Design a protein around this ligand. Structure first.
Ligand code: SF4
Lengths: 225, 230, 254, 124, 45, 158, 118, 184
DNA sequence: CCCTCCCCTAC
C-alpha cells in the first residue's frame, strides 16, 4: 500500500497482486474444521484489508483445501468471511478472481503461465541415477519446457480427466511456486523467448518477486521478521 | 449460560497455560505457541503438548466452572517443591461475573486479549525461575459450599455426569487463608507484594485480576529458585 | 484356524488387557469400540474371512457338506478347472441375508463379495456368532457376560431429519467439512496408489506410465493394501460422494 | 441462583456517580483528572466523594481495585508531565493523590475471615 | 551509529509531502484478457 | 540420633518383624500376596447386579472412591449421619497432584568336495487362457516354462 | 495534530494493553504515513516512563525490509534508505492481532477499478 | 463435643499410622489393602495391613494413647535404623488442645491433615527393605517404659479447641537408595 | 432340546 517505503510512484506501479497458492498449510490426516476456518478467516481479513488498495488473484496450492490432482479448481465461493460478500457478488471479479491451478494470465497483452509447483516437486521426489539445487531446478524447468508438456510424471501429478497439459501456445513468462530456491532465466527455444521464474515460499525466506511487464525484469523484495 | 461458560473455560485455560509457561513450572520446550486447542484462543497462547497435563488442566477448568456459582475467587498458588512455602499467588477475582441465565465474540475476545496481554506484561518483568525446582497448585475461595461430604450416602453411579459430580465433590480439601505463607518469624519479616492488573469487563463477564509476590524473606525462603541475580 | 483373524486379534487383545491391567472397564470400552467399528463398516474386510479346508470326495451328502463346499461347488459350476486340491483351505465370507436364511445359503466368496456392488457383510451375525461364544467362555469364569456389552451398543449430516438434505445452512462449516473429508479420502487413495506402484515396480522395473496400470491390475487377496484400495475406490464411486458433490455445488451456487 | 447471591450478582459492586462497571468508572476518573488539571484544582466535594468511594471500596476487601486506581492516577500524572507542569493544577493533584491515597492503602487488611497474615507495601 | 542517531537522521527530516490522502493516486490499470474469455483448458466439471 | 524428648515414654516392641510378618500372615490362613482380582475402572459398569455363573458367586468391586468402603476401626465402619453444615467464606484447595517436571522433561526427551545332498530342479508354466477360464490342459497350450536348478547343492559346475 | 494522536497512543498503550501500529493512526486520524511516522518520532521523545519497547524497521536500497532485534549492530549502515518506529510494544513479545478496518477514505493509493454492488 | 473428637481421632490416628507404615519400609509392600478402603473420602488410596494381629496391636496402642490423652503432650512415630538404634526420622503430632465444635469441621480438619501427610509422604525418597523399624513414643505433660534436624511443617486442625500441630523431622549408612509404590 | 457330521486341536 506504500505505507512502508513511502515511494508512492514506485508502489503504484504494482497493478495486480498474484498469490500463487499455499495460503494455508495443514495436515489433512488430523485436522478439524475449526482451525481451518480460523486460518481462512485470517486470510479473508488480510484480503479485505488489501483488496481496496490492490487487486488480488488467488490460486490453489498443494496443501490448500483443494483437489490433489494438478488441475486444481479455484478455492470456492465460500470459505471466506462475510465481509467479502460484495467482492463475491459475481459481477466484480476483476479485482478478486479465483482461477484454476494452471492458468494463462493475459496481463496487459502478456500471457503468463503459473502453476502451484506440484509437478516440479513430483519430479524432484524421484531419484534419477542418470543426470536439489537452484541450477538443477532451472535445468528441470528447461527440460519441462523443451518436452512440450507441463507434468512429465502424469501418475504423480494428475489423475484422469473430466489433454490440457499438452501445450498449445508457449507462454511469455513461466511461473512456478513452492520452491526452496528463487531463480530467473531467459531462454531461446526455436527462435522464441520464454522467461522462467521460480517464486520461493513466503513461510521460509519470505521474499517476493516484482515482475516488470515493460522490460521483462524481475526484482526481489526480502521481508525479515 | 452456553456461550459464557465456553468463554470462561477458554480464558481459564489460557490463564493457566500462560502462568505455567512464564513461571518455568514446566519446561518451555514442551510448551508450543499455538492458537487452536480445540477452542478459538484469543491470542497465540503457548499450550503444553503433554496429554496428561492437558487432561489435568481441562478437568481442573471444568471442575472450577461447575461450581462457579458458589466460587467468587479463583487463584493459582505457586509453591516451592523443596519446602511447602507459597512464593507467588496469582488470583483471578470473579467479583460479580454477571451470572445470568438469559455480546458477540469479538468484544469478549478483545477483552480477553487485553487481560492476557496485561498478564504477560506482568510476567516478563518477573525474574527467571530455576528448572525442576518449582510447583503450582490451585486454590479457590468459596462462599457457601461443602466439599468431600457427598460420599456419605454410599451413592452408586449410573451415568457419567453423576460420577463426574461425585468425583469433583471429593476432589477438594478444606484449607485456611494465608496458610502456606511464612509464619512471621519476626527477624526481618517478609512483606507480600501486591500488583494490580486490568481485567475483562464485557457485558456478560466481569473479571478482576491481581497477583501476589513475596519479594522478601528471612533466609531459607526463595533460595536457589530465582536463578541467582538473573 | 476355523475362525477369522479379526476374532483372534480381538481375543488376544482382550486376554492381554485382562492379564496386565486387570480392569474390565478397559476391556468393555475396547469391545464396544470394536463392535461399533464392525457395525459401521470401517473394517479391512480381510480379517473377517474364514479359512476351512474342504474334501470334495469325503462328504456323505450335499446337505452335510461344509460351508466352503458350497463355494467350491459354485466355482466349479462356472468352470470345471477350479477344482481345489485335497484338504485345501477355501476363503469365504458371510454377507447379509434375509431372516431365516441358512448360513450355507449365502456363502459369499471374497471374489464375489468384493466385486459385488451392493453386497454388505452380516455385521450382526459376525458380532454375535464369532465373538459372543468365545468371549463368554473366556470371561464367564470371572462372573461377567459379554452379551450385555454387545447389546448395550434423510440428511447428509447427523439435525435428526431434514434436495440438499441439510436443514441448517452453515455454509462456511459444511463446505469446510466436505473439503476436509474429500481431501482425506483423496490423500489416502494417492498414498495407496503410490504404495501399489512401488510394489509393482518389482516386476515392471519402471516408475513411469504403463506401470501404474499394471499396479492397478493387481488383485491379490493376501495383501491388505488391495482391500484398502478397493474400499477407497468404492467410497470414491459411492452414491454418498455424488451427494457430497451435489451439496457442494448447491452451496457454491450463490 | 440459590437464594444466596444477595443482589443481581454474587456480590454487590460499589457504585459511584451511578456507575457500576469498573472500566467505565476508571474512564470517568481518567476524564475527570484530565479535565481538572486545566481548571487549577479539583473541587472539594469531588475529592470528598472520591475519598468516600475509596474507603467504601477498601471496606469490602477490594484493595486490588484501590491499587489499580492509584496506579492509573500516578500514570496519568506522570504522562501529563512536561506539558501540563507548573500550572497550579499538577501540584495540588499530586499532593492530594499522595496524602489522601498513599496512607489509605495500608488500612483494613481484611479478607472476610480474620486478618491477612504478614503485611503488604504495594507496588504503587 | 546508534538507533537514536539513525532515527534522528531519518525520521526527523521527514518530507511530509505527497500524502494529502484526499485524492489518492490511481493504481496502474492491469487487465486480464482471459478473465471473461473463458474456454479454460484446465477447467474441469 | 534424634532425642526422644525431655520426658518420653517408650512403647513395647512390635510383635512382628519385616521378614516374619509375611510368614505369620500365611500361617494365619491368608495368602502371602493378595493379587488384585479383575475390577472396573469406573463404577458405571458395575450395574449393581449379582455376578455369578453356574451357581458360583463372584465378588467384583471397583477401585474408584465411590464404591470403596470407609476405613473401619474395631471392625465397625465410621461415617457422618448428620447433614453437613457449610459456613460462609470458606477456602478450598485442589487435592490431586500435578505432573512433575521430571516426567514432562522425560516425555519430551523421548518424543567339502563330496556330494552329500540331492540335486534340485524347479519348473513353472504360463498358459494363454481364453477370457477368464484359467489354464486348461485340453484347450489351452503352454506358452512359457521357467526352470531354475538350485545352485547351492548342484555339483560338477558344468 | 498534537495532543490527540499522543492521547490516542497513550490510551491504546496503557488503558488497554495492546501494541499500536502506524496503520492504526491512518485509520484513526485519516492522515498520511509520513505524518504518522513524524508523530511516532515526536512521541518517542519527551517520555520519562519507558514502559514500552519500540520496534524500528530498516528499509534498504534493495527494499530489504528487516526488523531490528539487537539494536546494537545493524548491517549495511550506509545502505539504509528509511528508518522509523514500526510499532510500540509494551512487552518483548509482539504477536499483533489483525481485524477488519473500514478504510473508507484513508487510502493513499487507490486502485483504478472501483467497487459496484448489484 | 468430645465424643466426635475422639471418634474421628481414632480413625485419623489409625489411617496416619497405616500410611506411615506402608510408605516407609518398616513393613514390606503388598502386605496392605490399598484397593478396598477409603480414609476420609479422599481420592488417594489409603493402605490397611491385612494381618489382623498388627491391626489389633495398632488399635490397642491408639486406644491406650487416647485413654491418657489429658496426660500426653506429644505423640510421635519413630523411624529407627537397624543395627544403629538411632531415630532417623520422627513424625510428631503436637498436642495443645484444652478439654461447641461441630462434627463436620473436625472431619474436614482431619481430612486436610491426612491429605497433607499423604502429600508429604509421597515425595519421600525410597528406602531399602529389611532395614527400618518403628516405635511409638508419647511425652508426658509435666506397656510404657522410661527413656541435625530437618523440620517440615504440616497443616493441622485449628478450627477451634483442637490445636493439633503436625510436623516431621529427618536426619544411616547407605540405607536410602533412590528407585511409584502403588505399582506392585 | 438332543443327535449327527464336519472341523480343529491337544496328548
Ligand atoms: S496390492 Fe498389495 S500386492 Fe498388489 S500391488 Fe498393491 S501392494 Fe503390491
Amino acid at each position: 500500500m506504500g505505507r512502508i517505503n513511502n515511494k508512492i510512484d514506485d508502489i503504484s506501479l504494482i497493478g495486480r497482486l498474484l498469490i500463487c497458492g499455499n495460503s494455508v498449510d495443514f495436515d489433512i490426516k488430523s485436522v478439524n474444521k475449526d482451525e481451518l476456518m480460523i486460518s481462512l478467516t485470517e486470510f479473508s481479513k488480510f484480503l479485505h484489508n488489501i483488496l481496496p488498495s490492490i487487486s488480488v488473484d488467488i490460486m490453489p496450492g498443494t496443501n490448500d483445501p483443494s483437489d490433489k490432482s494438478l488441475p486444481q479448481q479455484p478455492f470456492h465461493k465460500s470459505l471466506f468471511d462475510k465481509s467479502l460478500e460484495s467482492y463475491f457478488n459475481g459481477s466484480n471479479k476483476e479485482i478478486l478472481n479465483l482461477v484454476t491451478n494452471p492458468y494463462e494470465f493475459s496481463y496487459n497483452g502478456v500471457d503468463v503461465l503459473a502453476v502451484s509447483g506440484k509437478n516440479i516437486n513430483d519430479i524432484c521426489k524421484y531419484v534419477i541415477p542418470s543426470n536439489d539445487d537452484i541450477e538443477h531446478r532451472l535445468d528441470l524447468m528447461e527440460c519441462t519446457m523443451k518436452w512440450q508438456n507441463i507434468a512429465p510424471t502424469a501418475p504423480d501429478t494428475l489423475w484422469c480427466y473430466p489433454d490440457p497439459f499438452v501445450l498449445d501456445k508457449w507462454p511469455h513468462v513461466y511461473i512456478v511456486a513452492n520452491q526452496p530456491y528463487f531463480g530467473t532465466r531467459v531462454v531461446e527455444i526455436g527462435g522464441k523467448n520464454i522467461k522462467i521464474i521460480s517464486v520461493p515460499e513466503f513461510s521460509s525466506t519470505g521474499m517476493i518477486i516484482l515482475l516488470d511487464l515493460e522490460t521483462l525484469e524481475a526484482e526481489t523484495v526480502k521481508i525479515d521478521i | 449460560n452456553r456461550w459464557v461458560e465456553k468463554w470462561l473455560r477458554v480464558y481459564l485455560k489460557c490463564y493457566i497455560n500462560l502462568i505455567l509457561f512464564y513461571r518455568n513450572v514446566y519446561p518451555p520446550q514442551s510448551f508450543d505457541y499455538t492458537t487452536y486447542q480445540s477452542f478459538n484462543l484469543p491470542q497465540f497462547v503457548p499450550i503444553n503438548r503433554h496429554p496428561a497435563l492437558i487432561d489435568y488442566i481441562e478437568e481442573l477448568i471444568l471442575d472450577v466452572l461447575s461450581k462457579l456459582t458458589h466460587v467468587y475467587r479463583f487463584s493459582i498458588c505457586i509453591i516451592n517443591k523443596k519446602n511447602d512455602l507459597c512464593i507467588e499467588k496469582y488470583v483471578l477475582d470473579f467479583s460479580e461475573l454477571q451470572h445470568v441465565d438469559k455480546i458477540t465474540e469479538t468484544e469478549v475476545f478483545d477483552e480477553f486479549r487485553s487481560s492476557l496481554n496485561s498478564l504477560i506484561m506482568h510476567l516478563e518483568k518477573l525474574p527467571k525461575v530455576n528448572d525442576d525446582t518449582i510447583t503450582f497448585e490451585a486454590v479457590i475461595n468459596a462462599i457457601e459450599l461443602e466439599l468431600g461430604h457427598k460420599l456419605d450416602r454410599n451413592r452408586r453411579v449410573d451415568s457419567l455426569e453423576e460420577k463426574a459430580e461425585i468425583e469433583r465433590d471429593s476432589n477438594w480439601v478444606k484449607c485456611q487463608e494465608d496458610e502456606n505463607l511464612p509464619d512471621n518469624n519476626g527477624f526481618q519479616p517478609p512483606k507480600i507484594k501486591l500488583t494490580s492488573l486490568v481485567g475483562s469487563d464485557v457485558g456478560p463477564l466481569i473479571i478482576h485480576q491481581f497477583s501476589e509476590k513475596l519479594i522478601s524473606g528471612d533466609d531459607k525462603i526463595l533460595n536457589g529458585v530465582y536463578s541467582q541475580y538473573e | 484356524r476355523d475362525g477369522i483373524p479379526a476374532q483372534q486379534k480381538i481375543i488376544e487383545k482382550c486376554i492381554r488387557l485382562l492379564f496386565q491391567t486387570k480392569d474390565l472397564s478397559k476391556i468393555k470400552k475396547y469391545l464396544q469400540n470394536e463392535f461399533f467399528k464392525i457395525q459401521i463398516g470401517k473394517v479391512s474386510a480381510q480379517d473377517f474371512c474364514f479359512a476351512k479346508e474342504v474334501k470334495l470326495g469325503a462328504y456323505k451328502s450335499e446337505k452335510t457338506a461344509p460351508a466352503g463346499a458350497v463355494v467350491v461347488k459354485r466355482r466349479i459350476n462356472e468352470d470345471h478347472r477350479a477344482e481345489p486340491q485335497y484338504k485345501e483351505r477355501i476363503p469365504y465370507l458371510v454377507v447379509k441375508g434375509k431372516q431365516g436364511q441358512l448360513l450355507r445359503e449365502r456363502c459369499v466368496s471374497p471374489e464375489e463379495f468384493l466385486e459385488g456392488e451392493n453386497l454388505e457383510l452380516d455385521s450382526e451375525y459376525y458380532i454375535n456368532k464369532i465373538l459372543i461364544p468365545p468371549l463368554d467362555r473366556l470371561f464367564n469364569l470371572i462372573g461377567i457376560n459379554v452379551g450385555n456389552w454387545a447389546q448395550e451398543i434423510c440428511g447428509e449430516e447427523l439435525k435428526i431429519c431434514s434436495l440438499c438434505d441439510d436443514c441448517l445452512e452453515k455454509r462456511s462449516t459444511t463446505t469446510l467439512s466436505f473439503l476436509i473429508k474429500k481431501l482425506k479420502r483423496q490423500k489416502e487413495y494417492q498414498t495407496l496408489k503410490t504404495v501399489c506402484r512401488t510394489c509393482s515396480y518389482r516386476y515392471t522395473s519402471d516408475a513411469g506410465i504403463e506401470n501404474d496400470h499394471i499396479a492397478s491390475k493387481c488383485n491379490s487377496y493376501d495383501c491388505p493394501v488391495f482391500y484398502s484400495r478397493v474400499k477407497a475406490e468404492r467410497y470414491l464411486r459411492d452414491n454418498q460422494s455424488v451427494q457430497r458433490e451435489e451439496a457442494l455445488i448447491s452451496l457454491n451456487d450463490w | 441462583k440459590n437464594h444466596f447471591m444477595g443482589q443481581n450478582s454474587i456480590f454487590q459492586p460499589i457504585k459511584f456517580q451511578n456507575l457500576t462497571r469498573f472500566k467505565k468508572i476508571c474512564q470517568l476518573v481518567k476524564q475527570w483528572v484530565a479535565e481538572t488539571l486545566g481548571d487549577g484544582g479539583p473541587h472539594e466535594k469531588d475529592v470528598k466523594l472520591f475519598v468516600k468511594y475509596l474507603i467504601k471500596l477498601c471496606d469490602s476487601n477490594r484493595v486490588h481495585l484501590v491499587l489499580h486506581l492509584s496506579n492509573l492516577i500516578s500514570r496519568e500524572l506522570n504522562l501529563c508531565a512536561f506539558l501540563n507542569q507548573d500550572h497550579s493544577g499538577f501540584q495540588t493533584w499530586e499532593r492530594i493523590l499522595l496524602n489522601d491515597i498513599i496512607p489509605l492503602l495500608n488500612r483494613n487488611k481484611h479478607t472476610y475471615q480474620t486478618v491477612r497474615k504478614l503485611d503488604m507495601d504495594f507496588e504503587v | 551509529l546508534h538507533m537514536d542517531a539513525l532515527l534522528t537522521k531519518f525520521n526527523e527530516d521527514r518530507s511530509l509531502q505527497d500524502e494529502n490522502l484526499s485524492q489518492p493516486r490511481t493504481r496502474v490499470r492491469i487487465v486480464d484478457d482471459n478473465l471473461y474469455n473463458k474456454s479454460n483448458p484446465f477447467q474441469l466439471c | 540420633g534424634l532425642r526422644y524428648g525431655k520426658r518420653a515414654f517408650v512403647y513395647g516392641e512390635p510383635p512382628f518383624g519385616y521378614q516374619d510378618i509375611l510368614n505369620k500372615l500365611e500361617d494365619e490362613g491368608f495368602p502371602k500376596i493378595d493379587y488384585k482380582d479383575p475390577f472396573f475402572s469406573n463404577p458405571v459398569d458395575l450395574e449393581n447386579k449379582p455376578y455369578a455363573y453356574a451357581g458360583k458367586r463372584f465378588e467384583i468391586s471397583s477401585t474408584h472412591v465411590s464404591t470403596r468402603i470407609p476405613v473401619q476401626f474395631g471392625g465397625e465402619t465410621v461415617s457422618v449421619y448428620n447433614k453437613p453444615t457449610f459456613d460462609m467464606f470458606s477456602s478450598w484447595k485442589y487435592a490431586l497432584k500435578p505432573p512433575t517436571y521430571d516426567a514432562v522433561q522425560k516425555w519430551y526427551n523421548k518424543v567339502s568336495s563330496v556330494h552329500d545332498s540331492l540335486t534340485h530342479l524347479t519348473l513353472e508354466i504360463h498358459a494363454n487362457t481364453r477370457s477368464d477360464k484359467i489354464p486348461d490342459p485340453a484347450i489351452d497350450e503352454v506358452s512359457m516354462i521357467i526352470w531354475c536348478l538350485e545352485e547351492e547343492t548342484f555339483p560338477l559346475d558344468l | 495534530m498534537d495532543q490527540k494522536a499522543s492521547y490516542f497512543i497513550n490510551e491504546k498503550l496503557f488503558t488497554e494493553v495492546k501494541p499500536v501500529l502506524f496503520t492504526d493512526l491512518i485509520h484513526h486520524l485519516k492522515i498520511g504515513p509520513s505524518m504518522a511516522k513524524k508523530l511516532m518520532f515526536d512521541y518517542y521523545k519527551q517520555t520519562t516512563n519507558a514502559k514500552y519497547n519500540c520496534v524500528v524497521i530498516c528499509c534498504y536500497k534493495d527494499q530489504t525490509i528487516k526488523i531490528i532485534h539487537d539494536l546494537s549492530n545493524i548491517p549495511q549502515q550506509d545502505s539504509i534508505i528509511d528508518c522509523f518506529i514500526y510499532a510500540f510494544n509494551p512487552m518483548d513479545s509482539f504477536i499483533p492481532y489483525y481485524d477488519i478496518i473500514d478504510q473508507k477514505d484513508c487510502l493513499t493509493i487507490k486502485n483504478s477499478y472501483e467497487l459496484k454492488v448489484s
